[PDB]
Every structure is written in C-alpha cells, then in structure tokens.
Amino acid sequence: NVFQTRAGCLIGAEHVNNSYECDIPIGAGICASYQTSQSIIAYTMSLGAENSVAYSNNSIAIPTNFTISVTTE
C-alpha cells in the first residue's frame, strides 16, 4: 500500500482525507498516527482546531469566573 507525499515515498500507511492533530511529525505537514483493524495513517496535519470569534463593534465578552491552574515548567 503505497502513497506519494511531499516529503517522499511513504509505504504501509493508508492515506486519510480527514485531518487531525499532528502526532508523529514526518515532513511538510504530513503527520502520522496509529489509530483506525488498526493501521498507521498519514494525513495533512490540522494546525489547531478552528474557531471564528464572533465579533461586532459593540460586542464584548467578559469572563464571569476563573480557574487557577498550576503548570509545571
């Protein structure tokens, strides 16, 4: 099972038109992950999830509540 990429000739991973988070970085946006039986896949990495802020010149969103997170660095 062969597929042609931007980064070269890939073998043994079924192409996927869907696009998910980059998991195992390959090259030029192609990122592979294991999950679906199962087979290694290859797909164009989605950079981020998509959002569109709902914006209008009078529209403001002020947080009513908060969290306190402890992030190890």
Binding site: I60, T64, F66, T67, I68, V70, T71
Partner: protein, 228 residues
C-alpha cells in the same frame, strides 16, 4: 478565597499524578543527562578504534614491532584519539553554552517569576501569573507556575463612552457594559458589574467626537446626599 483554595489545592494534586506516570515531562532533563553520557560513551568507544593503525591497543602495537615503527603507528593512534577529544571537547563547549543559555532563562525566571510577579506575558506560562514555586530536580530546576485563567464568558453589549448632559464619561478602569438594558461599568478580567457614578467615570470632551457613545444617565453619589 475558599473556592480559590480548592482550585489551588486540587491543581496541586493533578501535578503529582502527572509526574507519577509521566516519564516525558522530564524529557528536557532526561535528554541532557542522556546526551552527555552519549558523547561520554562515544568518547570511550573511540579507544577501541584502529584509526588506521594496526591495532587499538597501545602496548600491543609496541610488543609486536620495534619502536621506530611504533613511533609511526602511535601517531595514527594519537592523531585519532587527540582528534576524538577535540570533537568531544568542542561538543561540550557548545553544549555547555546551551545549558548556559538555559541557566540564564532559569535564573531570570527564578528572579522575576518567583521573587516577583511577572508582568511579562506567557513568560511564566499561559494565563496571568500569580506566583511560582521552584522545585529542585537532578541537574535542573522545576517551577510550579500558579496562573490565573478566566473561564466562563457572557456576550455583552458595550460602549466606549456614555453621554450624560452632553459631557462624555469614560471609565477609570474597566469598561461600560450592559446586558441589554442597564449600563454597568466593570473591571476587565472578571465580571463584577457596578452602577455607574462619577467615582467610576471621569469627564472628558463632549458627545460629538466619540464614535459609539450611547445615551445614559450616570447616577451621582452626591445629589441624594444633599436632599436633606
């Protein structure tokens, strides 16, 4: 206060479960320890390489040959090993600076983040920063950044200004909002509506210039206080 306590205390508890099963979060440290022992290993293996000479054992070249030949061979040993040091050494210098570059980054976080409160954004991690707690780790340091992240939002109609008598009123701190009827001024990073009075707002200009000013009535603390 109480609600912030549990949010803090629980958020601590998550850390200890993270690191408990997490080998990767220390990858930065684990890599540094590795890469040294790596080049240290490779430095050692280079003692087993011929480098073109007839053997990699120093004496076994000697006792095989009469020394005036060994003087030639031991070159290709020395020329080899001496090089392999300068490779390893020049590595360490480069790698040392890399750590040196991360030491400044730590010694700055230690200074600014721990000992201060960092106005810098995302220097101490995502969210507005409250405090950090350093924790030692082998050949490294681990900060626990306590950061303030807002959560629940509510769409609000807002206005940059409010006419009263034709004067313009602007908030000292925060912004005029309304849920659609009553105009409230509130602080920015938390929703805490308050009725709009002169103590909330200062006067500047008049009603022509501002783009987006909206009619309203700014209540006066003082006026009722008079009426007796």
């Amino acid at each position: 206060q109480k609600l912030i306590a549990n949010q803090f205390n629980s958020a601590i508890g998550k850390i200890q479960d993270s690191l408990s099963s997490t080998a990767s979060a220390l990858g930065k440290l684990q890599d540094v320890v590795n890469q040294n022992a790596q080049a240290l290993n490779t430095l050692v293996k280079q003692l087993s390489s011929n480098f073109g000479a007839i053997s990699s054992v120093l004496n076994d070249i000697l006792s095989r040959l009469d020394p005036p030949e060994a003087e030639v061979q031991i070159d290709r040993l020395i020329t080899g090993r001496l090089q392999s040091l300068q490779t390893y050494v020049t590595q360490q210098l480069i790698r040392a600076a890399e750590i040196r570059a991360s030491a400044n980054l730590a010694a700055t976080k230690m200074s600014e983040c721990v000992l201060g409160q960092s106005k810098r954004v995302d220097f101490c991690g995502k969210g507005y920063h409250l405090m950090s707690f350093p924790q030692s780790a082998p050949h490294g340091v681990v900060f626990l950044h306590v950061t303030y992240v807002p959560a629940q939002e509510k769409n609000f109609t807002t206005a940059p200004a409010i006419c009263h008598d034709g004067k313009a009123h602007f908030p000292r701190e925060g912004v005029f909002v309304s849920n659609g009827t009553h105009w409230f001024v509130t602080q920015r990073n938390f929703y805490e509506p308050q009725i709009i009075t002169t103590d909330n707002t200062f006067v500047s200009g008049n009603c022509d210039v501002v783009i987006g000013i909206v009619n309203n009535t700014v209540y006066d603390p003082l006026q009722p206080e008079l009426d007796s």
